[PDB]
Amino acid sequence: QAAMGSQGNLSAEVEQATRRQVQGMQSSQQRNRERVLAQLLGMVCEVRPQVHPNYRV
Amino acid sequence: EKKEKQIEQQKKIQMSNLMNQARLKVLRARDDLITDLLNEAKQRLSKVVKDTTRYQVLLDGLVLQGLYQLLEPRMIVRCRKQDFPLVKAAVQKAIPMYKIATKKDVDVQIDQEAYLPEEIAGGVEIYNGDRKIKVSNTLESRLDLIAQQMMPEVRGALFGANANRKFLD
Amino acid sequence: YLSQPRLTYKTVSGVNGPLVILDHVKFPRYAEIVHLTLPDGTKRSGQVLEVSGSKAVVQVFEGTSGIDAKKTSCEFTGDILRTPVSEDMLGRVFNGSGKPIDRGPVVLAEDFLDIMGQPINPQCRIYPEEMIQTGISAIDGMNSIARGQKIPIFSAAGLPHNEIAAQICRQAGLVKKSEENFAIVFAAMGVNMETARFFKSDFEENGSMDNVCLFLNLANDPTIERIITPRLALTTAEFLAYQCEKHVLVILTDMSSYAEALREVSAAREEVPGRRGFPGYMYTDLATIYERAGRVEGRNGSITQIPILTMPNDDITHPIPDLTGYITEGQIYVDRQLHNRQIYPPINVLPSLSRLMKSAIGEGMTRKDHADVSNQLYACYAIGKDVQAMKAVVGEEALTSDDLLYLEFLQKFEKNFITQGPYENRTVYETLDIGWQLLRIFPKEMLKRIPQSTLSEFYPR
Amino acid sequence: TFGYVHGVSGPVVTACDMAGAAMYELVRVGHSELVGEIIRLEGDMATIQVYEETSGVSVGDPVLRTGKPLSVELGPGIMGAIFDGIQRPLSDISSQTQSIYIPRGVNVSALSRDIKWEFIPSKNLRVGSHITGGDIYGIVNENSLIKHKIMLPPRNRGSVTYIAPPGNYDASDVVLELEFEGVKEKFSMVQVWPVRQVRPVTEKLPANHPLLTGQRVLDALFPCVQGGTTAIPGAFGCGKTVISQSLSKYSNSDVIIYVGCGERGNEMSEVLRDFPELTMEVDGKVESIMKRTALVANTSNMPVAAREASIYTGITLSEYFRDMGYHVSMMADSTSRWAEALREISGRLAEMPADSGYPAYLGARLASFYERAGRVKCLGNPEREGSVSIVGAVSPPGGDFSDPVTSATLGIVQVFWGLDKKLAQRKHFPSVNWLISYSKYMRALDEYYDKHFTEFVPLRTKAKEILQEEEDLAEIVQLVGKASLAETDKITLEVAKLIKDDFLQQNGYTPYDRFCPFYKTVGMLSNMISFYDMARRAVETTAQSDNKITWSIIREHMGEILYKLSSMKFKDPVKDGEAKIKADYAQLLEDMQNAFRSLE
Amino acid sequence: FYRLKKIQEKKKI
């Protein structure tokens, strides 16, 4: 019974830890998102094409 | 003593497995959020498709870049049916620059029979004369590529930085 | 960075054994990674090896089977093999190629790294001095191991080297006694399912799963992946050693299977052979693997390496153990005679070797006379074996007194020094006390190697 | 003047459009400009060996053809540095990059240009004075020990036109100039010399003076000469490297150049960590041994082709310093690695293997490497005398001394030190065999050893006789079981045991036998041989008459004297005086004489 | 055996 009660307490503790960690991550991620989207889209729209460096005429 | 030992062994394995599953849940959540970010970026790109003025410039760049990469006397260009006029514009703007670049003459054509699936957000694919060598310069492929190539910067922006790391080289 | 799109191809000039040859390739790059799409939609990969003209050659990793010329597609990426590495990889499971096994997601990476790594500059190499506590007296006491060492473990088929390796992992630490620990990366080179279950369960037992990255390649996987898996694991180790300042221990297992796979891949190209048909450059390749270990100036981490290899037919002159003995700086030589007598842990000492002991020990490290005990104990062991070989012929009547002393020393030393048990972990000073307990059997006027001073101050008690 | 990379595979590549090219001409390949060399060609195609990792090179990359074969730079500042296999100053790299790696294709000059070395004029020349090749016209002090000296390069001569005054200058400042036949040519402090070419010399002279050795064994029993050859093959676990380091630390030579090849990284770490602490004085202040040592590191991982270049580079530096009148001593590590690298390279070219895959011409290459040695009279007016000694370490694969590389080596060298893995299992440091080794130089040195000692030949001969007779008796005592022994036989067996345990054994790290000079060797051998003689004479006299003396009787008679005899080796001569140990050994001889008189 | 094989292969050209 000591083992089973300790199992209950330890379980509840670890799901509490998991949930708070996940919520903290989510909150941190709702801080800054638009900057990176701008970064990726801006680098996508740029092209600057060129020929392979080793080409000769 | 044997029954005792059995009990502690089961206790240990149970705790360790529990901890494993908790960590795995954390990692799954992280991956899921990354996937959602990528989907959101895809939707933003699809919205940006609608503007014709800059879509034409991007299309011109794509076709030119494909022409440069292939380097074959004969070429074929395939695109969605509803982008086809702008593609004609792109090829007419693209041929002479290549001609002055590589000093060779190329017969550039556009298929009128096979057309890309509508599921493609946009872009252009190219083939050589024999349809053996092809360059997939679609928007989806480029979005994918740029996504995989910049991952560490993505978490660097999204998660801050890891204090334990001391040297970046 | 590179915005150039990735070309795909449909040219397959022909297949020959595990190779695939492409034609009409525009500027191939030596050692560039390529994906293959078969007619059935399943996927594979490969790496360019030989390039000439517009032709190129491609080693397939998954084994070539079901390749059609007119329907396969060969996508090129244009860079060398590059892997993701991240600190959180610890506590995961992966297969040979690096894809996850444990129902988890791919590794969001903190950086890309070269699979081959690149040589470290000998000037900025801090020589290893700090000693590790293994607990086993046959190592701590005879062939001590300092961090940064790359000593192997020699075994034979049907010997319990796995138990020794697991115990070594369990009891690793620092003799000189914040709480330090290890980050252990383990790679398997064609172990059976039983071995994998044993190692996984053992790491589960002591709660150490939080700090172990696993790399598993059973015999089911295509043999060519066995070439890549070691370097990948070793790269991960180097990252954790010099970018996280952690202390790391590496365990590659059954490199004999790796040598076999190397022979298999080499035979396709028809390179020049060596002894027992292995490639000539196999020596340099094993050097590329083993050396990547030690401690570097201006940092804090370090890489220790403990490869394990079996000896075919117990023939020590076989090329694999020999070239290992050349590259690395030691050996252990698990014995089977002791295993036949049902002794644990059955480790020979007479042919074991540890080049780093000359600076691992001394005053202020373990004890003043640590070297002397080692020298004298080995000498008595050797003369004891000689006396046994002599007794096997002459008979008990021909024995002089010192033969009897050497034989009882042999018996007592074998049943005491060597025999420890599944989990008994002796302190180093306990081991030295026991060694002196074995030395005291002989009268002081025969321990030739020990200096007169040490005998005066220690032997009588 | 650019080819293009037709093909690539391993460290062997191919380049078209190179019709104007020549064999052994260096070459830069790719955007990293990896150094290379020419080996084969066919038409306007060529084959380039690469001295660097080829991963990432692409077809069609530019390849720059240069205008010189492989060459090595010579001048001040070489001493005390550590170079890799093609002579990049490693310390400069580590300083410049602030990193812990070696980026591929890094270009840094062999020597520094931003250092001002003090210079002294010839003190014997003037405007219009004529010199020739090999004549010294400058002296630069690298440090207190070795005074650099600049000589005119070979294939140059003429009447001088300007000499710089004394003062501090760098390399780039022109120093000398001269007109030969209406052409004026300028000479700096830097010579560029083709590596595969021998430096000419006036005449090879016969050897005239021995070479001191640290270990007790391999000094009396198998001496070496100041300019001779020596080889140390032996299986693994035997540790040739310990002997190499011991020779390096303790020797009378003026410069030491220890070339590693394929060695372990930790061994170069030993060397770098350890040599600077040890010191020694010559004519005053005590200076570190690093101030007379130039190293050439090349560990296993490094590109396979560089192993070839490193060895030739090292011997070239040795010869350059030989043209100064010093006595250079060289230490080559695992030439089997060099042979194996050549084997691999020739394998990738699709050429004919000869013996175990080794190409045929490796014997010729090895012989060519060694023959550049020996004492020589130098080329130049100031009339310098010097020599080069070469002691190389072979690593037979498994100890099998019938392998091709050892077979080619044994035919060319003069001294050979066979080593035995069984002894090294006993930790019988040094694990030399003392029965298959030999040295042809004994006859030339007997004259010296007589002009100083006159009392060594009987000792050596009796030692060889006793060891040989022990080895003969080994079988008879093995089969019989140590029963059918006349007393003289037991005497020789047990005295052989004592000499083997005492004189032959020696620890290479403990302070009291890090070094052992010759006189102590003479003293110990004299003690043991005299004891043998007295024991046998007493046993003979007591055997013929009556009461034949058994070995047990003398053992119980003088076990204490035996114990003192064995413990003789605890001296550490560095602290204690020589005459003190001489008197000590005379006292032990007195003890033995007293015991033999009392038994008499 | 191997060296003979290499002759055989060379003769194909």
PDB file of N, CA and C in Angstrom, chain C residues 27-30 51 53 118-119 121-123 125 127 129 150 275 281 283-284 287 291 322 326-329 350-351 353 355 358 375 378 394 445 448-449 451, chain D residues 6-8 56-57 59 90-91 94 100-102 236-237 239 241 264 266 269-270 273 300-301 307 337 344 395-397 425-427 481 505 509 563 566 570:
ATOM      1  N   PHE C  27      27.804  18.269 -63.766  1.00  0.00           N
ATOM      2  CA  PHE C  27      28.703  18.625 -62.675  1.00  0.00           C
ATOM      3  C   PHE C  27      28.419  17.832 -61.405  1.00  0.00           C
ATOM      4  N   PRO C  28      28.738  16.541 -61.367  1.00  0.00           N
ATOM      5  CA  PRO C  28      28.637  15.807 -60.106  1.00  0.00           C
ATOM      6  C   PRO C  28      29.692  16.276 -59.122  1.00  0.00           C
ATOM      7  N   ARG C  29      29.384  16.123 -57.838  1.00  0.00           N
ATOM      8  CA  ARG C  29      30.305  16.434 -56.756  1.00  0.00           C
ATOM      9  C   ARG C  29      30.628  15.159 -55.998  1.00  0.00           C
ATOM     10  N   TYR C  30      31.915  14.891 -55.829  1.00  0.00           N
ATOM     11  CA  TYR C  30      32.346  13.719 -55.084  1.00  0.00           C
ATOM     12  C   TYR C  30      31.721  13.708 -53.698  1.00  0.00           C
ATOM     13  N   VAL C  51      33.650   9.491 -59.660  1.00  0.00           N
ATOM     14  CA  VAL C  51      33.124  10.399 -60.667  1.00  0.00           C
ATOM     15  C   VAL C  51      34.155  10.514 -61.771  1.00  0.00           C
ATOM     16  N   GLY C  53      34.173  12.147 -66.015  1.00  0.00           N
ATOM     17  CA  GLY C  53      33.379  12.646 -67.123  1.00  0.00           C
ATOM     18  C   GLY C  53      31.997  13.005 -66.633  1.00  0.00           C
ATOM     19  N   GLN C 118      36.576  16.076 -38.534  1.00  0.00           N
ATOM     20  CA  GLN C 118      37.792  16.601 -39.131  1.00  0.00           C
ATOM     21  C   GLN C 118      38.897  16.596 -38.090  1.00  0.00           C
ATOM     22  N   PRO C 119      40.155  16.409 -38.487  1.00  0.00           N
ATOM     23  CA  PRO C 119      41.204  16.121 -37.509  1.00  0.00           C
ATOM     24  C   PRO C 119      41.405  17.250 -36.509  1.00  0.00           C
ATOM     25  N   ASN C 121      43.882  19.368 -33.879  1.00  0.00           N
ATOM     26  CA  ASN C 121      45.243  19.851 -34.028  1.00  0.00           C
ATOM     27  C   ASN C 121      46.112  19.336 -32.880  1.00  0.00           C
ATOM     28  N   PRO C 122      47.190  18.585 -33.152  1.00  0.00           N
ATOM     29  CA  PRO C 122      47.932  17.973 -32.039  1.00  0.00           C
ATOM     30  C   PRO C 122      48.500  18.965 -31.047  1.00  0.00           C
ATOM     31  N   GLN C 123      48.790  20.196 -31.458  1.00  0.00           N
ATOM     32  CA  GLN C 123      49.349  21.140 -30.500  1.00  0.00           C
ATOM     33  C   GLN C 123      48.376  21.417 -29.364  1.00  0.00           C
ATOM     34  N   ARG C 125      46.251  19.763 -27.643  1.00  0.00           N
ATOM     35  CA  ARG C 125      45.780  18.526 -27.040  1.00  0.00           C
ATOM     36  C   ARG C 125      46.330  18.406 -25.631  1.00  0.00           C
ATOM     37  N   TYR C 127      47.038  16.319 -22.596  1.00  0.00           N
ATOM     38  CA  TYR C 127      47.225  14.894 -22.424  1.00  0.00           C
ATOM     39  C   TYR C 127      46.375  14.413 -21.249  1.00  0.00           C
ATOM     40  N   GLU C 129      45.161  12.787 -17.879  1.00  0.00           N
ATOM     41  CA  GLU C 129      45.820  12.444 -16.626  1.00  0.00           C
ATOM     42  C   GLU C 129      44.831  11.930 -15.590  1.00  0.00           C
ATOM     43  N   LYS C 150      41.434   5.334 -25.203  1.00  0.00           N
ATOM     44  CA  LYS C 150      40.656   4.621 -26.203  1.00  0.00           C
ATOM     45  C   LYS C 150      41.004   3.139 -26.198  1.00  0.00           C
ATOM     46  N   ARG C 275      46.056  -8.852 -45.744  1.00  0.00           N
ATOM     47  CA  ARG C 275      46.009 -10.124 -45.040  1.00  0.00           C
ATOM     48  C   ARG C 275      44.561 -10.540 -44.805  1.00  0.00           C
ATOM     49  N   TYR C 281      43.581  -0.269 -47.163  1.00  0.00           N
ATOM     50  CA  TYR C 281      43.274   0.976 -46.467  1.00  0.00           C
ATOM     51  C   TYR C 281      42.351   0.784 -45.275  1.00  0.00           C
ATOM     52  N   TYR C 283      43.178  -0.228 -42.503  1.00  0.00           N
ATOM     53  CA  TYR C 283      43.907   0.327 -41.370  1.00  0.00           C
ATOM     54  C   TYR C 283      43.618   1.813 -41.215  1.00  0.00           C
ATOM     55  N   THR C 284      43.754   2.568 -42.300  1.00  0.00           N
ATOM     56  CA  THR C 284      43.508   3.999 -42.206  1.00  0.00           C
ATOM     57  C   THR C 284      42.057   4.270 -41.848  1.00  0.00           C
ATOM     58  N   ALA C 287      41.593   3.794 -38.293  1.00  0.00           N
ATOM     59  CA  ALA C 287      42.206   4.943 -37.639  1.00  0.00           C
ATOM     60  C   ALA C 287      41.267   6.138 -37.652  1.00  0.00           C
ATOM     61  N   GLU C 291      40.564   7.162 -33.468  1.00  0.00           N
ATOM     62  CA  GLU C 291      41.347   8.240 -32.880  1.00  0.00           C
ATOM     63  C   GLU C 291      40.503   9.326 -32.243  1.00  0.00           C
ATOM     64  N   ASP C 322      44.883  -7.082 -34.663  1.00  0.00           N
ATOM     65  CA  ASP C 322      46.228  -6.529 -34.785  1.00  0.00           C
ATOM     66  C   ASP C 322      46.183  -5.042 -35.080  1.00  0.00           C
ATOM     67  N   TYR C 326      47.469  -1.834 -32.985  1.00  0.00           N
ATOM     68  CA  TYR C 326      48.344  -0.763 -33.443  1.00  0.00           C
ATOM     69  C   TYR C 326      47.747   0.603 -33.154  1.00  0.00           C
ATOM     70  N   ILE C 327      46.482   0.816 -33.514  1.00  0.00           N
ATOM     71  CA  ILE C 327      45.903   2.151 -33.390  1.00  0.00           C
ATOM     72  C   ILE C 327      45.731   2.526 -31.930  1.00  0.00           C
ATOM     73  N   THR C 328      44.862   1.808 -31.231  1.00  0.00           N
ATOM     74  CA  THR C 328      44.628   2.066 -29.824  1.00  0.00           C
ATOM     75  C   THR C 328      45.884   1.755 -29.025  1.00  0.00           C
ATOM     76  N   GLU C 329      45.848   2.115 -27.744  1.00  0.00           N
ATOM     77  CA  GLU C 329      47.011   2.033 -26.872  1.00  0.00           C
ATOM     78  C   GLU C 329      46.799   1.064 -25.718  1.00  0.00           C
ATOM     79  N   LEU C 350      47.905 -11.184 -18.084  1.00  0.00           N
ATOM     80  CA  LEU C 350      49.248 -11.308 -18.643  1.00  0.00           C
ATOM     81  C   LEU C 350      49.400 -10.605 -19.984  1.00  0.00           C
ATOM     82  N   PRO C 351      48.458 -10.687 -20.924  1.00  0.00           N
ATOM     83  CA  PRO C 351      48.578  -9.911 -22.171  1.00  0.00           C
ATOM     84  C   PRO C 351      47.830  -8.583 -22.192  1.00  0.00           C
ATOM     85  N   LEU C 353      47.227  -4.581 -21.447  1.00  0.00           N
ATOM     86  CA  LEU C 353      48.177  -3.490 -21.597  1.00  0.00           C
ATOM     87  C   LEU C 353      47.457  -2.162 -21.438  1.00  0.00           C
ATOM     88  N   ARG C 355      48.830   1.805 -21.805  1.00  0.00           N
ATOM     89  CA  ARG C 355      49.920   2.742 -22.036  1.00  0.00           C
ATOM     90  C   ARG C 355      49.821   4.012 -21.202  1.00  0.00           C
ATOM     91  N   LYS C 358      51.545   5.158 -16.991  1.00  0.00           N
ATOM     92  CA  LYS C 358      52.787   5.803 -16.581  1.00  0.00           C
ATOM     93  C   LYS C 358      52.573   7.221 -16.073  1.00  0.00           C
ATOM     94  N   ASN C 375      54.008  -4.055 -10.915  1.00  0.00           N
ATOM     95  CA  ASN C 375      55.132  -4.757 -11.519  1.00  0.00           C
ATOM     96  C   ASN C 375      55.355  -6.098 -10.836  1.00  0.00           C
ATOM     97  N   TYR C 378      52.489  -8.727 -11.433  1.00  0.00           N
ATOM     98  CA  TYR C 378      52.588  -9.325 -12.757  1.00  0.00           C
ATOM     99  C   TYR C 378      53.742 -10.310 -12.832  1.00  0.00           C
ATOM    100  N   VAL C 394      57.471 -32.385 -15.225  1.00  0.00           N
ATOM    101  CA  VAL C 394      58.493 -32.944 -14.343  1.00  0.00           C
ATOM    102  C   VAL C 394      57.882 -33.792 -13.232  1.00  0.00           C
ATOM    103  N   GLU C 445      62.772 -11.124   0.874  1.00  0.00           N
ATOM    104  CA  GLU C 445      64.045 -11.234   0.181  1.00  0.00           C
ATOM    105  C   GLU C 445      63.911 -11.818  -1.220  1.00  0.00           C
ATOM    106  N   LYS C 448      61.835  -8.874  -6.092  1.00  0.00           N
ATOM    107  CA  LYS C 448      62.999  -8.216  -6.666  1.00  0.00           C
ATOM    108  C   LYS C 448      62.647  -6.825  -7.179  1.00  0.00           C
ATOM    109  N   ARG C 449      61.537  -6.710  -7.908  1.00  0.00           N
ATOM    110  CA  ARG C 449      61.222  -5.465  -8.599  1.00  0.00           C
ATOM    111  C   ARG C 449      60.938  -4.321  -7.632  1.00  0.00           C
ATOM    112  N   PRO C 451      61.188  -1.566  -4.816  1.00  0.00           N
ATOM    113  CA  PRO C 451      62.368  -0.987  -4.172  1.00  0.00           C
ATOM    114  C   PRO C 451      62.463  -1.394  -2.711  1.00  0.00           C
TER     115      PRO C 451
ATOM    116  N   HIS D   6      39.006  16.343 -64.572  1.00  0.00           N
ATOM    117  CA  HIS D   6      38.239  15.368 -65.328  1.00  0.00           C
ATOM    118  C   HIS D   6      37.586  14.344 -64.414  1.00  0.00           C
ATOM    119  N   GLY D   7      38.312  13.855 -63.411  1.00  0.00           N
ATOM    120  CA  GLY D   7      37.789  12.804 -62.555  1.00  0.00           C
ATOM    121  C   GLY D   7      38.330  12.889 -61.144  1.00  0.00           C
ATOM    122  N   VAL D   8      37.707  12.118 -60.256  1.00  0.00           N
ATOM    123  CA  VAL D   8      38.043  12.099 -58.837  1.00  0.00           C
ATOM    124  C   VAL D   8      37.669  10.738 -58.272  1.00  0.00           C
ATOM    125  N   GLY D  56      34.154  16.759 -51.423  1.00  0.00           N
ATOM    126  CA  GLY D  56      33.526  17.976 -51.878  1.00  0.00           C
ATOM    127  C   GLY D  56      34.046  18.508 -53.198  1.00  0.00           C
ATOM    128  N   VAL D  57      35.212  18.047 -53.649  1.00  0.00           N
ATOM    129  CA  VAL D  57      35.726  18.494 -54.933  1.00  0.00           C
ATOM    130  C   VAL D  57      34.774  18.066 -56.042  1.00  0.00           C
ATOM    131  N   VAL D  59      33.841  18.033 -60.443  1.00  0.00           N
ATOM    132  CA  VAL D  59      34.423  17.986 -61.775  1.00  0.00           C
ATOM    133  C   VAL D  59      34.469  19.392 -62.350  1.00  0.00           C
ATOM    134  N   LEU D  90      52.585  24.700 -37.510  1.00  0.00           N
ATOM    135  CA  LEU D  90      51.326  24.429 -36.835  1.00  0.00           C
ATOM    136  C   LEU D  90      50.990  25.519 -35.823  1.00  0.00           C
ATOM    137  N   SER D  91      51.986  25.987 -35.071  1.00  0.00           N
ATOM    138  CA  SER D  91      51.718  27.006 -34.062  1.00  0.00           C
ATOM    139  C   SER D  91      51.177  28.279 -34.692  1.00  0.00           C
ATOM    140  N   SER D  94      47.464  27.664 -35.368  1.00  0.00           N
ATOM    141  CA  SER D  94      46.605  27.710 -34.190  1.00  0.00           C
ATOM    142  C   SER D  94      46.459  29.137 -33.680  1.00  0.00           C
ATOM    143  N   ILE D 100      40.554  25.070 -33.013  1.00  0.00           N
ATOM    144  CA  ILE D 100      41.237  23.833 -32.648  1.00  0.00           C
ATOM    145  C   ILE D 100      41.315  22.843 -33.794  1.00  0.00           C
ATOM    146  N   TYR D 101      40.946  23.240 -35.002  1.00  0.00           N
ATOM    147  CA  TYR D 101      41.003  22.401 -36.189  1.00  0.00           C
ATOM    148  C   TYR D 101      42.053  22.904 -37.168  1.00  0.00           C
ATOM    149  N   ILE D 102      42.257  22.129 -38.229  1.00  0.00           N
ATOM    150  CA  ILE D 102      43.159  22.504 -39.316  1.00  0.00           C
ATOM    151  C   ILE D 102      42.330  22.706 -40.577  1.00  0.00           C
ATOM    152  N   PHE D 236      53.609  -5.364 -31.569  1.00  0.00           N
ATOM    153  CA  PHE D 236      52.945  -4.430 -30.667  1.00  0.00           C
ATOM    154  C   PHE D 236      52.887  -4.976 -29.250  1.00  0.00           C
ATOM    155  N   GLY D 237      52.638  -4.077 -28.308  1.00  0.00           N
ATOM    156  CA  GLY D 237      52.805  -4.354 -26.909  1.00  0.00           C
ATOM    157  C   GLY D 237      54.240  -4.269 -26.447  1.00  0.00           C
ATOM    158  N   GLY D 239      56.483  -1.690 -27.487  1.00  0.00           N
ATOM    159  CA  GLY D 239      56.778  -0.311 -27.175  1.00  0.00           C
ATOM    160  C   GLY D 239      58.120   0.172 -27.675  1.00  0.00           C
ATOM    161  N   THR D 241      58.296   2.980 -29.048  1.00  0.00           N
ATOM    162  CA  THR D 241      58.229   4.421 -28.840  1.00  0.00           C
ATOM    163  C   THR D 241      58.934   4.838 -27.559  1.00  0.00           C
ATOM    164  N   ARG D 264      50.319   7.672 -32.899  1.00  0.00           N
ATOM    165  CA  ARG D 264      49.154   8.066 -32.125  1.00  0.00           C
ATOM    166  C   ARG D 264      49.237   9.548 -31.784  1.00  0.00           C
ATOM    167  N   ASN D 266      48.247  10.847 -28.938  1.00  0.00           N
ATOM    168  CA  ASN D 266      48.710  10.951 -27.562  1.00  0.00           C
ATOM    169  C   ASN D 266      50.226  10.878 -27.465  1.00  0.00           C
ATOM    170  N   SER D 269      51.436  14.133 -28.015  1.00  0.00           N
ATOM    171  CA  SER D 269      51.068  14.893 -26.830  1.00  0.00           C
ATOM    172  C   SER D 269      52.087  14.692 -25.711  1.00  0.00           C
ATOM    173  N   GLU D 270      52.453  13.434 -25.417  1.00  0.00           N
ATOM    174  CA  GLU D 270      53.652  13.175 -24.617  1.00  0.00           C
ATOM    175  C   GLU D 270      54.803  14.078 -24.996  1.00  0.00           C
ATOM    176  N   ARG D 273      54.281  17.839 -24.368  1.00  0.00           N
ATOM    177  CA  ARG D 273      54.128  18.129 -22.950  1.00  0.00           C
ATOM    178  C   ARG D 273      55.445  17.970 -22.214  1.00  0.00           C
ATOM    179  N   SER D 300      47.717   9.524 -37.561  1.00  0.00           N
ATOM    180  CA  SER D 300      47.154   8.540 -38.481  1.00  0.00           C
ATOM    181  C   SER D 300      46.107   9.144 -39.411  1.00  0.00           C
ATOM    182  N   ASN D 301      45.126   9.865 -38.861  1.00  0.00           N
ATOM    183  CA  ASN D 301      44.044  10.431 -39.668  1.00  0.00           C
ATOM    184  C   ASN D 301      44.510  11.278 -40.829  1.00  0.00           C
ATOM    185  N   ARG D 307      51.934  11.251 -45.657  1.00  0.00           N
ATOM    186  CA  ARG D 307      52.887  10.379 -44.991  1.00  0.00           C
ATOM    187  C   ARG D 307      54.162  10.241 -45.802  1.00  0.00           C
ATOM    188  N   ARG D 337      54.342   2.256 -41.838  1.00  0.00           N
ATOM    189  CA  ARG D 337      53.236   3.111 -42.239  1.00  0.00           C
ATOM    190  C   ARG D 337      53.516   3.781 -43.571  1.00  0.00           C
ATOM    191  N   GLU D 344      48.894   1.626 -50.658  1.00  0.00           N
ATOM    192  CA  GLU D 344      47.530   2.042 -50.956  1.00  0.00           C
ATOM    193  C   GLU D 344      47.488   2.915 -52.202  1.00  0.00           C
ATOM    194  N   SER D 395      57.419  -1.719 -37.939  1.00  0.00           N
ATOM    195  CA  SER D 395      56.308  -2.319 -37.205  1.00  0.00           C
ATOM    196  C   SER D 395      55.770  -3.497 -38.007  1.00  0.00           C
ATOM    197  N   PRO D 396      56.373  -4.676 -37.904  1.00  0.00           N
ATOM    198  CA  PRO D 396      55.909  -5.803 -38.701  1.00  0.00           C
ATOM    199  C   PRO D 396      54.495  -6.188 -38.308  1.00  0.00           C
ATOM    200  N   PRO D 397      53.635  -6.557 -39.267  1.00  0.00           N
ATOM    201  CA  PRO D 397      52.236  -6.827 -38.917  1.00  0.00           C
ATOM    202  C   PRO D 397      52.066  -8.143 -38.177  1.00  0.00           C
ATOM    203  N   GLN D 425      55.731  -9.198 -22.502  1.00  0.00           N
ATOM    204  CA  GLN D 425      54.676  -9.720 -21.643  1.00  0.00           C
ATOM    205  C   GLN D 425      55.171  -9.836 -20.209  1.00  0.00           C
ATOM    206  N   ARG D 426      56.459 -10.120 -20.037  1.00  0.00           N
ATOM    207  CA  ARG D 426      57.083 -10.101 -18.717  1.00  0.00           C
ATOM    208  C   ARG D 426      57.340  -8.673 -18.203  1.00  0.00           C
ATOM    209  N   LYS D 427      57.064  -7.650 -19.012  1.00  0.00           N
ATOM    210  CA  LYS D 427      57.449  -6.263 -18.720  1.00  0.00           C
ATOM    211  C   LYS D 427      58.942  -6.182 -18.464  1.00  0.00           C
ATOM    212  N   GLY D 481      64.293 -31.794 -16.674  1.00  0.00           N
ATOM    213  CA  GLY D 481      63.676 -31.410 -15.428  1.00  0.00           C
ATOM    214  C   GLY D 481      64.638 -30.942 -14.359  1.00  0.00           C
ATOM    215  N   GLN D 505      67.670  -6.042 -17.456  1.00  0.00           N
ATOM    216  CA  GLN D 505      66.465  -5.316 -17.086  1.00  0.00           C
ATOM    217  C   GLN D 505      66.815  -3.877 -16.729  1.00  0.00           C
ATOM    218  N   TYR D 509      61.333   4.810 -16.677  1.00  0.00           N
ATOM    219  CA  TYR D 509      60.643   5.954 -16.098  1.00  0.00           C
ATOM    220  C   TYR D 509      61.083   6.285 -14.688  1.00  0.00           C
ATOM    221  N   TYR D 563      72.534 -10.325  -2.803  1.00  0.00           N
ATOM    222  CA  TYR D 563      71.498  -9.305  -2.686  1.00  0.00           C
ATOM    223  C   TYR D 563      72.069  -7.915  -2.928  1.00  0.00           C
ATOM    224  N   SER D 566      72.705  -7.535  -6.718  1.00  0.00           N
ATOM    225  CA  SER D 566      71.536  -7.198  -7.518  1.00  0.00           C
ATOM    226  C   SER D 566      71.076  -5.774  -7.247  1.00  0.00           C
ATOM    227  N   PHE D 570      70.442   0.478  -7.920  1.00  0.00           N
ATOM    228  CA  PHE D 570      69.789   1.634  -7.303  1.00  0.00           C
ATOM    229  C   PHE D 570      70.869   2.673  -7.018  1.00  0.00           C
TER     230      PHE D 570
END
